[PDB]
Amino acid sequence: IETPITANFREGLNVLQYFISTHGARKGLADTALKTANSGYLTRRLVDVA
Amino acid sequence: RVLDATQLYLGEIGYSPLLTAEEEVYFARRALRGDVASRRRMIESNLRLVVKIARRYGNRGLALLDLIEEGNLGLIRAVEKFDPERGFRFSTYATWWIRQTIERAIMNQTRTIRLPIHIVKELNVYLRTARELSHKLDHEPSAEEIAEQLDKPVDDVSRMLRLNERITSVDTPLGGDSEKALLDILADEKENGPEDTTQDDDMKQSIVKWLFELNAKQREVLARRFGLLGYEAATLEDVGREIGLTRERVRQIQVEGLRRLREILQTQGLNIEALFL
Amino acid sequence: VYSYTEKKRIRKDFGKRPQVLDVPYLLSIQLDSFQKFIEQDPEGQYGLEAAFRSVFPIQSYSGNSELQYVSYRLGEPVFDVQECQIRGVTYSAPLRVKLRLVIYEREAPEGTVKDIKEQEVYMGEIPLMTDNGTFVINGTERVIVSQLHRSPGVFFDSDKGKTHSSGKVLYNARIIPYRGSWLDFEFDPKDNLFVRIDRRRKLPATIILRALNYTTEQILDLFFEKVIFEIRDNKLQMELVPERLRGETASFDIEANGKVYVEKGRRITARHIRQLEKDDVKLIEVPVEYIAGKVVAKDYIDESTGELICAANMELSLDLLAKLSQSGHKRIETLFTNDLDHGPYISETLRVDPTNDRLSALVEIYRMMRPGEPPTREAAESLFENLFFSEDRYDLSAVGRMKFNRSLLREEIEGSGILSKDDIIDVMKKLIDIRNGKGEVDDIDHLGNRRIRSVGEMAENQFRVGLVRVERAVKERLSLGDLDTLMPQDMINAKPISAAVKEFFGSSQLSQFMDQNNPLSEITHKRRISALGPGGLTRERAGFEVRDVHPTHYGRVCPIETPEGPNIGLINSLSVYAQTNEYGFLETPYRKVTDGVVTDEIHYLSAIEEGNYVIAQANSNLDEEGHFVEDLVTCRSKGESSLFSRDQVDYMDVSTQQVVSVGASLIPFLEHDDANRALMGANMQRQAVPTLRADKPLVGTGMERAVAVDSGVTAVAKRGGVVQYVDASRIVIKVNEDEMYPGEAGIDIYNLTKYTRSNQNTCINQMPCVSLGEPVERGDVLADGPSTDLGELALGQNMRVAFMPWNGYNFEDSILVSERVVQEDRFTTIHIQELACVSRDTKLGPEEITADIPNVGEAALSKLDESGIVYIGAEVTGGDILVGKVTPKGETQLTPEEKLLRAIFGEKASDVKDSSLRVPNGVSGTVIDVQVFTRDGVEKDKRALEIEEMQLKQAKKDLSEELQILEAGLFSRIRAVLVAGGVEAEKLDKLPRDRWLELGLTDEEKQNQLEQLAEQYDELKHEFEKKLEAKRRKITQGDDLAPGVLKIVKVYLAVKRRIQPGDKMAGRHGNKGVISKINPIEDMPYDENGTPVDIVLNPLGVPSRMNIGQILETHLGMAAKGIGDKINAMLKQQQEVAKLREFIQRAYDLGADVRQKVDLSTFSDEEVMRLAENLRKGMPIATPVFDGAKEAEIKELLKLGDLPTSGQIRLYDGRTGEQFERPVTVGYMYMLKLNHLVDDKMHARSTGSYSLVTQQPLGGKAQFGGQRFGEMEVWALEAYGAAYTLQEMLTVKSDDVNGRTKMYKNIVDGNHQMEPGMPESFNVLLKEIRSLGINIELEDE
Amino acid sequence: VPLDGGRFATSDLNDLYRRVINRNNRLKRLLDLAAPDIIVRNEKRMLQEAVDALLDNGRRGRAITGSNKRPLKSLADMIKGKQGRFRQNLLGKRVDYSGRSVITVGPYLRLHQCGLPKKMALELFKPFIYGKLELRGLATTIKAAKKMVEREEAVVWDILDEVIREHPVLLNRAPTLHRLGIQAFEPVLIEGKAIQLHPLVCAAYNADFDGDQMAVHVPLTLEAQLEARALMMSTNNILSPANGEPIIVPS
DNA sequence: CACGTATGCTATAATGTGAGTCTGACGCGG
DNA sequence: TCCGCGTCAGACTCGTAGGATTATAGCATACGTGAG
Ligand SMILES: Nc1ccn([C@@H]2O[C@H](COP(=O)(O)OP(=O)(O)OP(=O)(O)O)[C@@H](O)[C@H]2O)c(=O)n1
């Protein structure tokens, strides 16, 4: 994102900085649910081969 | 890319000749006398009629093709027992046969546990009655309300409605996702847990030891009666077949064996402990 | 100006932004939507009216008979919500519909004068929505979650590369109806326009126009601009439009008049263009070689022969030009097609099109959908017209037509549900405009393209499906039957419609068990939006783009509330102020800014309307009754944010809260919390189990009261007035004359729900808030629900918390709690689980519910009464029998060991088993209630009969007290009317009230009032009779159960669970923990004052977590409690009401720029001491979300409490007595006990039952299951050495049947030897492969 | 099999076998009856459709939907999928002498120990109790031993304490990414329902105590006990299988 | 001989069908 | 070499819910086995 968050958590994000934060946060959380799958599929392919 | 069994067959039926009245009479007279070609043409020409009835007979049991094939069996019996001498048309007579054979197959094959036509016919009347009740009673029919209307037994109405209850798939996953199928919940009841099977082994082994702890003529008259050591479970009177050959002395000795063994369970530490069991 | 319940306890507000609009009713969507479905509208096609008019009238295939719809009506519900929940039936109304069978003559042309048969037929019961927003389906409260789907209309999208490593952007249009086949247009790498009907095989786009009867030349006239070529004398000329060239390179020397403008081989800039246009250039001379390639528009034929020289859409040549000239044509219309802006797409598509005329096109379309089947002309016309041009099979709906027309830039919103020939061409035009460069592609993630379906639309659709199934049956029977004997009800079946709707409200993905741990859980579940289930996305289908926060979610959808899981991003909580527009798009309130001044005029803007205006931020500073203080205000438009001048600003955010959802609005210092942690915080508040003592939150936001009231779990006063009678069961209020209607008696009765089971087996208890003889207004809280304090929402309990390590007892989030917490029974919770015992009928015989049970201790049977049912109030523990039952056994063929055993004790105990319902193992509690459901015919149990005696007498008492209080209240009014113009005070009281039918006065308005009160009295007199007969009938009524089932006994247990190690606790900043140890009071860190801390939380679970909210909550919590401790001290010493008033006013009016004013004074002395008594256990403070308390305000509040500004204190270790070597942050964190109790999750198994086919042990604690030893877990043993451990796990522990018993025997024998075998799963595998017809044999050594 | 409700429940293979038999027998009939060839053909198509559905449903085009709309599970489907029989019932299974519960800290423990709830351990070592009970002659037989455990008699606790001594138990956490996701410990009987985990091994399990749960497994044989104590013990697995750096360390 | 189960026949003419779509990726075969 | 086809996609946990859906005709002779 071209606009960074100027604030910190002690300062309090404002409504716009918090909303902009959400994107990164949720992509992180979705990443843990979804990517652990291709990660895990790689573990299993490796195990079968060796 | 016509690959579908259905569209292929319906293409082949369309490709047939359609029969008239006088043509039906010519073919039908030759057919009953035993013409090969006449039979084939009357069947092949009237396939369209089966399909029409088969089309208004789906979503009830089998698939369209299934219904079609069954209906076709009715067409053959129709051609077999058609009367061309009677002025009345074939289509009218065939319709009965086609509907009959389709319905009969739908009453048998549809249900995994094969339900007899007799119960099915009874069920029809119960259901039709329920419908008329529902239209006037804004609520739905009770078993007792249906029984009152037919003047029949509540028990008999309930037995029938029970047989209406249709079958659950074991292979079907239930937890919405394919999380667990019903098979995985439902345990083998006929198979005992190793805990239970081991307990019976302990009792069976203890018996041999218990038989070789009392009197030699007390374990030889108690065991062979219950079928514990013997091969066949005999009665007080039947223990005479071995060597006992008595009725009174067998009954005194059976109970004498059990009385000395009741003291053996009181002293080991069971008796009232193993009475709840 | 504060209400009565607020006078008892006022929350201090640190908010500074005045709220122009109040939080709406939070359960608006569910109620409005379903209300529209059942709502009787004559015109406005909504729910049923629409459904009937759409399908009906149904006319027969013969056309003699037709069935037409008149009107419908819902019968009143057979059972109340209460009886439905108990009995386990759907709460529904019978649907009675008036239908008229009209018959035509076949002999007369259309004579309707034969038979009209009109009757009111039953078609199903429709489930009704509760006042709260729920449905009770088979005795279970369920919510039908609103859905989010792609809006009907048109959408222009594009594979951004994807296909062809060429990397070509292929543009496509998709026309989406509400019902019908989809119409796709798409481009091919070679720039040929294609049509996919119903996403089937590809067809050339021009073919569809031929089917709509377009000649080649008409098609070309539609897409292409004509360019005229005049052939003058011998030289070639063409009519020029100055611009057309524009950004092209001149292929010839362009000469105009006599003078050369372009140089040949140079690019024509803007100067050349304006020079040519101003010179008024209309003819330019051109070489003959330039036309080689140009496309002719019309058919040009030889006027002499009358044969075609060139067909339309044909590439011209030098010789075709020559032939054209000499025939006598000196004008040639050619397609303007200059690449770049005007592409020849349709021209090339016509060359790909194998079809010629309309018929050939209709045949090819017919052959696509129905490949193989020979065409007929009737068949092809019928199919094509029935695809997109039939009113019955195609319907864009109002929203489809509206979004369609706006996408094609129309003026008219409303129109036809069927696609016009004009529509299709306009869509193709726009597609090609986009592939030209003049146009943009619609966004799929844009909320302007995602629409909300709540309930009413979805119930409507299922109901239409039911009707469609009925239409086939109806039309079928109308044609076959004789018309005159046959009435309409013998044709209609109710079971198809009832089945369609039952499957929606019962089987459907969006119908799910209400989430009922706590009020917030309920309220948030009812405002859920799911993109999943039918007509939506799947987890497989769902990408990464859909899941992420879209710019348009601002003010409509919460960006911080979504399941952390596979459903992340597909499920969304609705925002606070958000609502559905008439068409079902989401919209958000905004304050209109007029001439720079910010009005209170409030406009709800849809996603698409929002893009157009510049909206200022809520935090933007307004100047005292007019415009913005600051010159450059921070605003947002076009989906992005920056500074703007004041004149540019159009609108502004209504509240600072509107971005956030309900759940997140309850997090105090959200502003200081990372969005991830905040998500889990809002998510765990829903898991909070209500405690025995519902404790308010000291650090709140203000949404607390809104949520508690709107959830419906609190009893709120409609009428108000003064409380006549309080009871731990009921509240009767006498209404005030101003709201009290003069018709009925003016006494409201709220019956409180006592200790009842939830879906999660939690406890639902209503307690009375107000005292006897308290005055209350409309909308005052009369009784508190389960997790609510005086009107405010109370999900858990606030605690003195200190941030510091303990002896590893708070290692990784692990929590150290004081014994004082357990003692004070805070976080003690009571669970209410329902257990049923079913008496069925088997092939062997009916099961008996007798107390007479083979092989059972007198200890066990002591607790069962005559019938075999446990007593009310009886405490029970695992294995105790609740309802005794025995399964009849037929010819039990016992063995010699069993026959000798049965002979020894002689306890033959008849031919019967023991299948008694007994308390599940380890669960222990008190029987609160028992219910018995019997079939009508079978003789009632002794215990069932005494239960009915109780219900009957209790019913009689209830109704009697109704008529008595209602008669007393009604004559109390007659007494006041009679005094009006007839003074008889003492004289009227002496004669009996029962003999007042004679009493009147002169004929005025007051005599008419006496008549009203007398007619009501008698109305209530008969009403009481028919009510009592209804109650008596329901109590005697024997219930229709499942087939097989003779009777059912439902036992309700109550268990009290104590807090304990393993139990899961959290805060509201997403901060979880498991309790590790309960420390003695002596051991816990204590203050200089000697007061021990309740909880010791680990400092290291804060800076890593980046939820700083919890620490601000702790500092403010201590400051709140600081002021509570001062008020507690002043109340202990009585002191002056004047002095308390002083301190409390200085306190409420602290904040630097506090919005909330509290002019204490007006409060009467009695109101003030009731207020102080509540403020004593800590002054409750509200920190709005994004308009919260500042650090400086919190430190200022701490100074008012004489607590430290650092909010750190000197602490002493309870064990040693020595001081901790540095100050520790202490204060009050509001903590929650989540549903995840160790009591429930704890499970263990040695040996148990085993699965049917695989012979492996079952899974799950409810099935007494072994833990799954997965591939992952196997590999670990493989990495190690552990080969015996692995074989164990594969064989004697799972399948190996012989092995497991043999090894059990060895372990009791103490041999610890395995003796392995063959796993039964492998034997199955073999059988499964041989069933495929593959020979798989074991080859021996 | 009969469900409790009096209803029956069956495999979809029964529906597929019945399809095949009905159409096959109907084909026998139409051959006995000398039916015209178009009808014979339709029946032969339908017979091949039914067998192909029975072997592998969904491969031959549109799979045959049963009762809900879900395609009937065929023979190949029970072998094939991850869910088939290989991955689900054969490369991993559900297991006897297995338990689970919430985990919580045990800072008092030594590295080779773990807090095991009393009631959980009572159940896991049931056969081992039965065995010592009969060798002490405190229990006359197994069913009396079971009833002594059911009554949870005071002498039983003392015997259970004696069995657990020097007996290793496997703790497992999902997901098991690497071999240290299973470790052996000597158990310590504790009052309370939560498993107590040593802090220093929390790294290998990726265990944090905000409600995670662990599987418990009892190695039965002498061989399995020795493999747990020597190979899989916490103390003996200090270094990781990947890098040479230690995984067990204070935090 | 009664009870359960099955195969029989009905004569106005009627004779042609009919769900949900959209993941993104990769590796062969025609 | 371009494009329909078909095989892929983490590990354990618990809590669940529904049996719902459907229509078939009615009656006589024949086929076959079991009770008194
Ligand atoms: N869907 C999930 C969630 C969690 N885990 C495992 O459980 C661990 C702990 O999850 P969690 O407690 O949510 O994360 P932490 O990093 O411990 O953070 P915190 O508890 O402070 O939120 C994850 O890292 C992961 O190994 C997983 O495998 N799959």
Ligand SMILES: [Mg+2]
């Ligand atoms: Mg965790």
